């Protein structure tokens with residue numbers, strides 16, 4: 001996947017706080033993460049895709065091969081098992097930890113990068129446009 005390549009800035013966000021809460025993020029991390037307006041920088045080198053989110057809150061980075069599970073430390077310090085695939089042009093990122101699971105879909109829509117975060121009954125949607 002490469003249509004995802006480029007530098008992206010968060011422009012809008014709905015229900016993210018509820019999302020973080022449901023995932024289990026403590027209030028302190030919720031406050032500073034909810035107010036963050038991170039840049040998402042996505043690059044690809046062959047089979048390795050790298051995605052960085054930079055913000056004053058925290059900088060994070062993952063690098064992976066489609067279909068290969070990998071260990072991740074999240075901005076909220078969860079140690080999760082992550083598995084990202086490309087499905088109908090949508091990057092589907094799954095995190096599993098403690099028998100729980102959350103799903104993050106990244107898609108390209110017009111000129112937006114759209115992010116859908118799902119946990120249990122909560123769905124948060126985030127939009128990012130080119131910088």
Ligand SMILES: O=C(O)c1cccc2c3c(n(Cc4ccccc4)c12)CCCC3
Pocket residue numbers: 010020025033036038053054055057058059060074075076104115117126
């Ligand atoms: O829009 C995001 O960057 C984002 C997308 C999906 C899930 C998450 C979580 C967070 N962000 C935002 C974020 C992450 C790293 C750096 C800045 C902002 C998500 C914060 C920690 C809990 C889970």
